[PDB]
Amino acid sequence: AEAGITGTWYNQLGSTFIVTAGADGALTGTYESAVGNAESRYVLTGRYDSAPATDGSGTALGWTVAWKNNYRNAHSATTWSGQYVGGAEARINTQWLLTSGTTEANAWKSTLVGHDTFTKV
Amino acid sequence: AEAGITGTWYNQLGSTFIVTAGADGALTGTYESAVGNAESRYVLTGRYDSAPATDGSGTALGWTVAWKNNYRNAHSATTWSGQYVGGAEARINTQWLLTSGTTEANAWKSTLVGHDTFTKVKP
Amino acid sequence: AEAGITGTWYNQLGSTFIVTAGADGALTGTYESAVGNAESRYVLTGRYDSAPATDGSGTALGWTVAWKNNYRNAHSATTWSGQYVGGAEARINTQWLLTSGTTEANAWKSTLVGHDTFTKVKP
Amino acid sequence: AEAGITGTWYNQLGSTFIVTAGADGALTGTYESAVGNAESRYVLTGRYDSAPATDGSGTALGWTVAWKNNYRNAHSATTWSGQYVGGAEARINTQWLLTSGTTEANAWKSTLVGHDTFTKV
Ligand SMILES: [Cl-]
Ligand SMILES: [Cl-]
Ligand SMILES: [Cl-]
Ligand SMILES: [Cl-]
Ligand SMILES: [N+]
Ligand SMILES: [N+]
Numbered sequence: 379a380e381a382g383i384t385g386t387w388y389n390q391l392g393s394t395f396i397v398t399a400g401a402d403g404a405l406t407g408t409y410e411s412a413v414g415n416a417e418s419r420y421v422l423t424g425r426y427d428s429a430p431a432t433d434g435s436g437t438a439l440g441w442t443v444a445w446k447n448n449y450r451n452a453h454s455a456t457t458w459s460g461q462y463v464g465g466a467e468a469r470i471n472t473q474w475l476l477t478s479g480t481t482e483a484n485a486w487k488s489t490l491v492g493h494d495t496f497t498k499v
Numbered sequence: 500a501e502a503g504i505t506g507t508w509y510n511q512l513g514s515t516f517i518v519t520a521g522a523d524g525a526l527t528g529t530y531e532s533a534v535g536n537a538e539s540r541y542v543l544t545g546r547y548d549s550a551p552a553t554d555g556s557g558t559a560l561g562w563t564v565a566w567k568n569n570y571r572n573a574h575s576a577t578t579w580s581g582q583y584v585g586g587a588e589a590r591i592n593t594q595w596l597l598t599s600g601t602t603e604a605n606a607w608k609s610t611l612v613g614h615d616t617f618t619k620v621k622p
Numbered sequence: 623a624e625a626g627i628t629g630t631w632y633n634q635l636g637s638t639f640i641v642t643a644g645a646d647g648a649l650t651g652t653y654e655s656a657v658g659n660a661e662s663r664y665v666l667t668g669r670y671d672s673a674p675a676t677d678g679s680g681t682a683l684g685w686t687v688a689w690k691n692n693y694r695n696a697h698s699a700t701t702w703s704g705q706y707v708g709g710a711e712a713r714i715n716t717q718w719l720l721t722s723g724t725t726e727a728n729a730w731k732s733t734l735v736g737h738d739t740f741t742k743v744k745p
Numbered sequence: 746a747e748a749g750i751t752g753t754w755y756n757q758l759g760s761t762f763i764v765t766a767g768a769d770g771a772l773t774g775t776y777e778s779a780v781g782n783a784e785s786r787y788v789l790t791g792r793y794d795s796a797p798a799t800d801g802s803g804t805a806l807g808w809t810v811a812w813k814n815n816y817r818n819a820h821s822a823t824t825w826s827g828q829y830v831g832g833a834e835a836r837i838n839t840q841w842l843l844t845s846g847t848t849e850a851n852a853w854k855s856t857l858v859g860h861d862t863f864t865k866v
Contacts, residue, residue, distance in 0.1 A: 391730060403565050403567060404544065405544075405563075413730055413731075414731075421523075421524070423525065423545065423546060423563075424544060424578075425542065425543070425563045425565035425576060426576065427565040427566060427567045427572065427574050427600065428567060429567060429572050430574060430600050431574050433602070434602045434603075435602055436603075437600055438565065438576040438598050438599060438600045439576050439598075440563035440565070440576040440578035440598065441578070442526075442544075442545045442560075442563060442578065444524050444547055444548040444559065444560065444561070445548065446524060446549065446550060451550050453548050453551060453552055453559055454548060454559045455547065455548050455559040455560055456561070456580070457561035457562075457563065457580040457596070458578065459577065460610075461598055461600050461601070461609060463603065471606065472598075473596050473610050473859075473860070474596075475561070475578070475594055475596060477559050477561070477581050477593075478559060479551055479556040480556055480557065480582070481554065481555055482555070482584070485557070486635060486736055487720075487734050487736075488557075489594055489735055489736065490731050490734055491719070491733055491734070491735040491858070492730055493840070534853055534854070594737075607758060607780055608843075608859070610857060610859065611854050611858070612735070612842070612856055612857075612858040613853055614737050646788075647811050647813060648790065666792070667772075667790045667791060667792055668790065668809045669788065669790060669810065669811035670811055671813045671819075671820050671821060671822050673813060674820060674846055675820055678848055678849070679846040679847055679848055680846045680852070680855075681846055682811065682821045682822040682844050682845060683811065683822055684811070684822040684823070684824035684844070685824075686790075686792045686806075686807035686808055688795075688805065688806065688807070689794060690770060695794065695796050697797060697798050697805055698794065698805050699792060699793065699794055699806050699807040701791075701807035701808070701809065701824030701825065701842070703809075703822060703823070703841075703842035703843070703844045703856060704856075705844055705846050705847070705852075705855065707849070716844075717856055718842075719807070719826035719842060721805050721806075721807065721827055721828055721839075721840070722805060723797050723804055723805045723828050724802055724803065724828070725801045725802055726803075726830065729803075729828075732828060733826060733827075733840050
């Protein structure tokens with residue numbers, strides 16, 4: 379819990395997430411997706427709540443990735459919100475929101491929602 | 500545009516968002532919330548997509564706030580996903596997810612969803 | 623209250639919702655949308671929780687619309703989840719999920735989320 | 746696809762869903778949950794899109810359950826949106842919204858979001 383977040387994680391789609399959790403709640407790393415208008419690693423930044431409760435709970439965290447890198451600009455950003463749980467098999471369970479930049483005309487259809495489970499396997 | 504996003508913003512609940520959009524697509528600042536087990540400012544970090552399109556599309560962005568500071572710890576974190584629309588009345592329209600740390604058993608009810616609109620006042 | 627919900631309602635996009643709240647907690651009616659691969663009325667079915675609280679809480683409800691009628695088929699369905707707030711200006715505030723049928727491969731991008739507010743005009 | 750929706754399904758939590766899909770898009774049945782202020786079966790009603798595409802896609806559908814029965818009234822309603830996919834192992838993959846009736850003061854925190862995968866196993 380708290381700790382253990384640092385490392386390389388993978389989700390059901392094959393995307394890889396490499397993060398560093400800092401003593402004071404920062405989350406920094408890079409994201410390589412398996413889907414979308416993605417081509418390479420993207421920078422990610424987030425926060426995690428460094429003093430989780432001392433009961434059998436997971437650690438809340440969230441992060442963002444703007445899908446723009448030296449290779450692609452998909453004019454969109456994804457944020458994942460979820461919680462980290464450790465143990466023999468640690469995972470991060472998240473729900474995400476992906477918003478694309480649209481014209482007002484298409485604003486009603488700008489956000490996709492999904493879920494992802496990351497493991498270090 | 501980074502500038503365009505930089506500034507002080509408020510939403511309909513009365514929360515304050517102070518942000519700096521940096522060259523490299525980063526977003527840093529503090530969030531003051533009007534609701535929840537919150538007290539004072541909290542640090543936020545996000546990213547925004549620095550090269551939007553010409554046209555009249557919004558700039559997609561997103562940021563996270565873990566509700567822990569030196570005064571409180573709510574054991575939860577919210578991420579806001581949305582777009583910035585500039586003009587005379589610049590607005591950031593978002594959808595957010597708030598997750599609380601829970602035991603595996605109550606995990607099914609760990610995330611809330613909602614939407615917020617922010618109006619800019621200062622740079 | 624069933625009555626209270628029964629009526630003609632419009633949201634900010636210009637879509638029409640005609641509903642009948644029945645005794646047994648059911649919701650039946652037609653939806654006319656202003657956006658999407660939609661043409662004409664579609665059938666909706668939902669439920670609402672017939673015994674709310676006294677107090678000034680909203681009545682939780684929800685309904686589904688599969689976007690297929692005799693004129694079009696969009697292979698998608700939307701569910702709206704929210705609450706009814708009565709008074710002189712009765713409103714139904716919702717959050718919706720729109721899922722499109724896709725291949726397993728593009729399933730990750732099958733659902734859109736958003737929010738709608740409905741204003742009542744007729745019973 | 747289209748067909749096959751009728752039957753008894755179960756989700757990862759143990760909730761049971763029994764539905765009847767009608768030739769014209771109606772979904773009717775009852776829901777027995779494993780979690781919440783639930784006590785027994787609840788009536789559910791929904792719709793499904795009866796003419797799915799003739800390509801390897803799933804069938805879109807959605808349904809609602811107001812958590813009020815002769816035994817409990819949890820002043821809330823849940824709607825599930827997702828798609829049915831058949832094959833040797835058929836499943837219904839959904840994302841749900843659960844709204845409780847609150848005072849305006851608490852309206853900002855009235856909706857929970859999650860996901861559920863139902864199988865006939
Ligand atoms: Cl991904
Ligand atoms: Cl807020
Ligand atoms: Cl609509
Ligand atoms: Cl359930
Ligand atoms: N993703
Ligand atoms: N559920």
